[PDB]
Amino acid sequence: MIVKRPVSASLARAFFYIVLLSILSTGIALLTLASSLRDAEAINIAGSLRMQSYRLGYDLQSGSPQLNAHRQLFQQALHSPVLTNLNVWYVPEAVKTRYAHLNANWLEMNNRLSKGDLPWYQANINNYVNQIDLFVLALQHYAERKMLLVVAISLAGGIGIFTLVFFTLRRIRHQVVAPLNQLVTASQRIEHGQFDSPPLDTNLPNELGLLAKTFNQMSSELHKLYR
Amino acid sequence: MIVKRPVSASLARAFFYIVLLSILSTGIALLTLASSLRDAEAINIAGSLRMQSYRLGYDLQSGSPQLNAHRQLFQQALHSPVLTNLNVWYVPEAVKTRYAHLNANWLEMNNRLSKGDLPWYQANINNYVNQIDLFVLALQHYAERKMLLVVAISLAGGIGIFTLVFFTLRRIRHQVVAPLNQLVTASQRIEHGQFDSPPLDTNLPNELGLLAKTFNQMSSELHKLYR
């Protein structure tokens, strides 16, 4: 007789899938989270471009001596690491294209400001800041999508592990635990001249099926000797 | 003879801890993520208060007919659902206190604007917008802390499951799989007049220890009968 389906292989498979699922869900979550750690920063700094743009107009209207320094601050912010790092493959096209537009818009705005052209400013600032606002909103929505992805993966991971464990344990109980208990009972009985119990089920394709067959025969012979 | 440590109880315990860890890490992650789904929105809208505040000054300097509508827009934004929902127990005191300050500051700003008081505006707008900027930054940092918490829990969950599974499988292999294989070998041997093999180790406190003892005796008697 042989064991067609050894428990060692079956168990190894079951635990492998548990770990694979844990690693997959965890790895995707962490990768997504890693790409997201500066989402809030990005939305703050991008948003600040809107305030800085109107502060420049306020500076111009008022003859503020801070106008040049504020122009330089806007350019630094626009070109901050957190915004420049958006030009990467996994960031959506729309985010990158909007950012490109803001950079082009700034060149015209900074030039008009250098010529002190207030009427141009007044005629254009609404549209100019609208375009920044849409950039910020795109970043916001991108941040939201990434977080929902993490929620989905976290949920599916937990559900998936719960489900794998449920069936794994069920299989171990039906194919290992219950038959072992039957073998122990039959053993303990046979060991005390109880010999007319139901014979063990031998249908399992694992080690316990083989032990049941051998037991049924180590037992049946005794009963006949005595008996 | 008895079984002092039944496999059923040992297995039930091991899988329980696997699931408990999965549920705990998943539950904390999801609760934290749930509290965070509007973090980006909050930072966008809060940030916009800075731009709106300078736009009001620009409106005042220029005699804009949009001044009143912009005043009403600022108040709507300040009191948006996403910001009003910040007054909840799990949001840090500092976020809530800053928000309270912005609300008080607005009352004075809106009044001065209703009196058209430009010199007061020019003398106060820097400090006023600084206070909004610190609010936005507090929201940013709060968002960052929550995300790091999710990273930690995700990581510890995955590591924890990997570790539980490693030892669980190790125990099942040492206490169930290996002894079962020995029982099968001894069985198959005995079934073919091989009777001088090493006797089975009987030290396991589970079902396999008992089966080994009974086997060692169902076998030893045969060898003597024949042999």
Contact residues, chain B, for A125 at CB < 8 Å: 58
d(CA A169, CA A176): 10
Contact residues, chain A, for B210 at CB < 8 Å: 184, 187-188
CA torsion through residues B38, B92, A45, A35, sign: negative
For residues A151 and B175, the answer to whether their CB atoms sit within 8 Å is no
Gyration radius of chain A's alpha carbons: 36
Is residue B100 classed exposed, middle or buried when 0-12, 13-18 and 19+ CB atoms within 10 A define those classes?
exposed
| Contact across the interface for A181 and B29, Cβ inside 8 Å | no
DSSP B187-224: HHHHTTT---SPPPP---SSHHHHHHHHHHHHHHHHHH
Q: Residue A185's domain spans which residues?
A: 11-11+169-224
For residues B146 and B39, the answer to whether their CB atoms sit within 8 Å is yes
Q: How far is CA A148 from CA A26, A151, A152, A155, B198, in A?
A: 15, 5, 6, 10, 60
Q: Does A160 touch chain B (CB under 8 A)?
A: no
Joined tokens for residue B217: 């005796």
d(CA B113, CA B57): 9
d(CA B189, CA B216): 13
d(CA A120, CA A68): 18
Q: Does B225 touch chain A (CB under 8 A)?
A: no
Please list, in sequence order, all residues whose beta carbon lies within 8 angstroms of the beta carbon of residue B132, skipping any fewer than 6 positions away. B46, B49, B50, B53, B102
Structure obtained using: X-ray
- B193 dihedral zone (left: phi>0; alpha: psi -120 to 50; beta): left
Give helix then strand counts, H and E, for chain A.
8, 0
| Contact across the interface for B207 and A184, Cβ inside 8 Å | yes
Contact residues, chain A, for B51 at CB < 8 Å: 47, 50-51, 53-54, 129
| Contact across the interface for B19 and A161, Cβ inside 8 Å | yes
DSSP A151-213: HHHHHHHHHHHHHHHHHHHHHHIIIIIHHHHHHHHHHHHHTTT---SPPPP---SSHHHHHHH
Read off the CATH number of the domain in which A180 is found. 1.10.8.500
For residues A226 and A193, the answer to whether their CB atoms sit within 8 Å is yes
Joined tokens for residue B227: 């042999």
| Contact across the interface for B151 and A30, Cβ inside 8 Å | yes
| Contact across the interface for A151 and B33, Cβ inside 8 Å | yes
**Among A15, A125, A211, beta carbon nearest to B183:** A211
Joined tokens for residue A12: 């190894």
**Among A25, A44, A191, beta carbon nearest to B140:** A44
Q: How far is CA B172 from CA A95, A184, B169, in A?
A: 52, 18, 5
d(CA A72, CA B174): 69
d(CA B190, CA A53): 91
d(CA B125, CA A64): 13
Burial string for A88-123 (b: 16+ CB within 10 Å, else e) reads: eeebeeebeebbeebeebbeebeebbeeeeeeebee
Nearest CA distance, B83 vs chain A (angstrom): 15
Q: Name the residue in chain B with its Cα closest to that of A3.
A: B184
Whose CA is closest to B31, among A158, A109, A84? A158
Nearest CA distance, A198 vs chain B (angstrom): 19
In the stretch 165-204 of chain A, residues with CB closer than 8 A to chain B read 165, 168-169, 172-173, 176-177, 180-181, 183-184, 187-188, 191
DSSP A139-154: HHHHHHHHHHHHHHHH
For residues B47 and A50, the answer to whether their CB atoms sit within 8 Å is yes
Joined tokens for residue B223: 């060898």
Q: Does A47 touch chain B (CB under 8 A)?
A: yes
Whose CA is closest to A18, among B24, B178, B160, B28? B160
Instruction: Give the largest CA-CA distance in chain A.
Output: 117
Q: Name the residue in chain A with its Cα closest to that of B210.
A: A184
Instruction: Please report, as a single letter, which amino acid is at residue A207.
Output: E
